[PDB]
Curated annotation (Swiss-Prot), chain A:
InterPro entries: Rib_uL2_dom2 (IPR014722), Ribosomal_eS4 (IPR000876), Ribosomal_eS4_central_region (IPR013845), Ribosomal_eS4_central_sf (IPR038237), Ribosomal_eS4_N (IPR013843), S4_RNA-bd_sf (IPR036986). Residues 41-104 form the S4 RNA-binding domain. Pfam families: Ribosomal_S4e, RS4NT. GO terms for molecular function: rRNA binding; structural constituent of ribosome. Belongs to the eukaryotic ribosomal protein eS4 family. Coiled coil: none annotated. It is found in: Cytoplasm. Its main location: cytoplasm. The keyword Ribosomal protein applies. This is Small ribosomal subunit protein eS4. GO terms for cellular component: cytosolic small ribosomal subunit. PANTHER family: 30S/40S RIBOSOMAL PROTEIN S4, SMALL RIBOSOMAL SUBUNIT PROTEIN ES4. Keywords: Cytoplasm, Ribonucleoprotein, Ribosomal protein, RNA-binding, rRNA-binding.
Length: 259, 164, 141
RNA sequence: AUCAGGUUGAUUCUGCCUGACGUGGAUGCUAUUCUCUGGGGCUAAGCCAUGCAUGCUUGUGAACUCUUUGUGGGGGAUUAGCGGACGGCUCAGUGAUAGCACGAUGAUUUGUUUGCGGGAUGAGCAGUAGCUGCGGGAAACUGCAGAUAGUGGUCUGCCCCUGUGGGGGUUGGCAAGUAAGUUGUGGGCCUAUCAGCUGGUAGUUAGGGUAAUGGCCUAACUAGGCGCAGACGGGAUACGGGGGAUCAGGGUUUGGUUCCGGAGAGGGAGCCUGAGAGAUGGCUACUACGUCCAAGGAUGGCAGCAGGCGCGAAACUUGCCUAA
């Protein structure tokens, strides 16, 4: 036990992938690349469980070797390629576009979009370095972009072209904005910033759902997706990320309990 | 071979060691290379990751720097006169880091004539016998070369009291 | 009894300089709330293991203790107190841990057996030392 | 959230012994069906007959071969490349150097994956696999001659550290992701008919070695370091957790065994190739037991899946599979 492992047992697969407990002993192992390993799903599951296109694996490998898929406007033919949050999946025949999201139950979700919305991507700026006489910035999906503004720093959200891969414009975080929580206890919930305070080298955002509930979370689990409550830069899913509590779910089915 | 683990040492309280593993190639080491003077010989070794070190077995022609003017010259190595740790490394003419060597003085003939025989008169007396003193700040067993600077003033007096 | 010529790692002076005009000693201000002593500026010593004028970085947890011994060269023994909870009997017990700590020479005539010190965590410094003294508090009479 | 029987001629007590309820192993009688879930761990980490458990891809095209024939085709040997460090089995060693929890790496390396960067169509000589012949040996294995791709030296240029001298190298990169190494503190197995223990032992200064910090190793010098809040020793069926059983509460007992971490391949050592091994379906030696021979040599590793012997109170098929 000093050499890398190449297999996944099925009990250890992440809960967001929604895999049945039986159905074999193994699960697809994702490859290295764009996103982290705890924040991606293999490409081959998206085409046979979330679209139910291929019923098999002999068929799923006829769809990928015929070059019919494009992640972020770029053809992919590998079933282990990893796909992450806010990524566009395009399918030429039967023209369609999807964006990869979460539920409020914290599972994955494919959300259909239009064509002039399929030329976007939102990411956070994490690193920044200079090499060979050029200034770079590093995305949160892992890319480097050269020759951006000199006034983009760690934390801002940037908009990537997705057909030339170049920055368009960005968002600086401050009160009266919108947020998507990409991980943690509160994954898949949208809010509106109220206060920004500090602690021992931390920043915490007080938030407020689109229904009145309150909220709070560090700045490492949040991406800005809007300028104000009616200026969001992507299309949200059907439910908008509310997460009604369990008191408020039985009254829907049972009414109130007045004295 | 040489191995750099500490699984075989007595404990902080003095208790005898208990070993439950064979040695690992993770922590393997080498025998000391002993760089002598004369007729350059350097060897490339293959190290972890596929990378490369250069292990000098013999060397001539250091690459020294005159500090007051800031110019590099390539001189010739004559002999070793002081090593701070072991003086059995001076009887053998072995070149480690921070050993003081006696160097040939011709290539610095332009540089030394910007200093008078005023406050440094001990630098001008050895120049007329034909040699200067230098000191090595590279690691000849790890990079395959000697590289240092010439002693003047404060340094040259501190070390001169050592090797007489 | 020095064996090499004394000079801080990082600065480089010139051979024929004056004793009043030559480079300045570089010092710090340590983990945010600890200022360097004043015997760190006005003193001559070379310590590569010193937190202020040295080459070590302090990234880790800070702890407190009581000076128990001062008998080796630049190394003291500090005792730290703590407590453990028993579940079956519903009570605590008092316990201690021993540390070997690096004391730089800028604390020469300051710490005595019985004071309290604040130490920081470093990379391994010897077989038993992995921490350093940052400040102290002299005992009250 | 419960009690019964038993010391007396009769009595009230103290006190243990026994019954009444679960659970893991072995065993007697007796048995119709289907559905889920288990089965050589304890004794011998004892010894093993026979079969199977690891091979693929070409910008590579030999022998041979076709065509009325040419910078033509078929054919498939060998070069070159990738993998065999994972998967599977077991619990001897290890009482904390392992494992779990929270930390440091500003002290480090990372093939395949992703996005950027980077690349000698110059001279001049050596020379090989397959292939075509002569052969040795009981075997297992092997030699010599002939002629050719890739290829290997040396100059030339290119790049690097320098320069009022010179000296090296032969194209090897950056950032993410994935993996790996190193390191701090803390935890109820039993034992004082175990009370004092420790010499690379505790520290300083220099160098070597390493991918990297460090007595990891060496030279010189100081005299330290741990302990009834149990040191240093010795014992028992000691792999650690996630977990299991019992059941008012508080507690007691157990975990060889699906998932994650470690360690090992009869016993010890030492190494090569490679991004990664101190590898055992890799190599070399000593050592336990061996096996085949024409006698001079050559060889073995089921704690992989079936199976056999042995051991014991104690545990299944030498089956079918180009489907999930």
């Amino acid at each position: 036990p000093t050499g890398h492992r190449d297999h996944l047992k099925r009990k250890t697969a992440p809960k967001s992938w929604m895999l049945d407990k039986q159905g074999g002993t193994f699960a697809l192992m994702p490859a290295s690349g764009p996103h982290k390993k705890t924040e991606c799903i293999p490409l081959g599951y998206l085409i046979s469980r979330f679209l139910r296109y291929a019923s098999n694996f002999k068929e799923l490998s006829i769809i990928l070797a015929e070059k019919n898929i494009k992640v972020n406007g770029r053809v992919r033919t590998n079933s282990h390629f990893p796909v992450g949050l806010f990524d566009v999946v395009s399918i030429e025949k039967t023209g369609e576009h999807f964006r990869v999201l979460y539920n409020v139950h914290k599972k994955f979700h494919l959300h259909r979009i239009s064509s002039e919305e399929a030329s976007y991507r939102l990411t956070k700026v994490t690193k920044k370095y200079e090499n060979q006489g050029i200034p770079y910035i590093v995305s949160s999906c892992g890319l480097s972009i050269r020759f951006c503004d000199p006034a983009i720093d760690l934390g801002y959200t940037i908009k990537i072209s997705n057909e030339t891969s170049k920055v368009i414009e960005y968002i600086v975080p401050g009160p009266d904005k919108v947020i998507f929580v990409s991980r943690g206890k509160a994954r898949g919930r949208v809010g509106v910033i109220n206060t920004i305070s500090t602690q021992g080298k931390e920043t915490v955002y007080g938030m407020t759902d689109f229904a009145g509930n309150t909220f709070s979370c560090t700045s490492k689990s949040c991406i800005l997706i809007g300028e104000s409550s009616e200026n969001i830069w992507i299309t949200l899913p059907k439910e908008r990320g509310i997460r009604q509590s369990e008191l408020e779910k039985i009254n829907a089915q049972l009414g109130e309990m007045i004295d | 071979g040489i191995n750099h683990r500490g699984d075989h040492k007595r404990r902080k309280t003095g208790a005898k060691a208990v070993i439950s593993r064979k040695k690992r190639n993770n922590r393997a080491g080498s025998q000391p290379s002993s760089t002598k003077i004369g007729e350059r010989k350097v060897t490339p070794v293959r190290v972890r990751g596929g990378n490369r070190k250069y292990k000098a077995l013999r060397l001539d022609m250091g690459h020294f720097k005159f500090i007051t003017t800031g110019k590099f010259r390539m001189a010739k190595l004559l002999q070793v006169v002081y090593h701070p740790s072991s003086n059995e490394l001076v009887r053998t003419n072995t070149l480690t880091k921070s050993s003081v060597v006696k160097i040939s003085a011709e290539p610095f003939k332009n540089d030394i004539k910007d200093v008078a025989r005023d406050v440094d008169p001990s630098l001008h007396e050895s120049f007329e016998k034909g040699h200067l003193y230098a000191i090595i700040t590279s690691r000849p067993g790890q990079v395959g070369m000697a590289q240092g600077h010439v002693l003047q003033g404060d340094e040259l007096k501190f070390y001169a009291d050592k090797f007489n | 009894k020095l064996k090499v010529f004394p000079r801080q790692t990082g600065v480089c002076a010139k051979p024929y300089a004056s004793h009043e005009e030559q480079p300045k000693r570089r010092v710090n201000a340590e983990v945010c709330g600890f200022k360097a002593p004043e015997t760190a500026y006005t003193r001559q010593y070379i310590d590569k293991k010193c937190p202020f004028t040295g080459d070590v970085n302090v990234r880790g947890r800070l702890f407190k203790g009581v000076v128990k011994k001062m008998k080796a060269e630049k190394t003291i023994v500090v005792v730290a107190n703590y407590v453990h909870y028993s579940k079956k009997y519903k009570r605590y017990s008092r316990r201690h841990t021993n540390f070997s700590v690096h004391m730089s020479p800028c604390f020469e005539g300051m710490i005595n057996v019985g004071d309290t010190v604040i130490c920081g965590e470093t990379r391994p410094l010897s077989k038993t030392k992995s921490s350093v003294v940052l400040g102290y508090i002299k005992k009250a009479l």
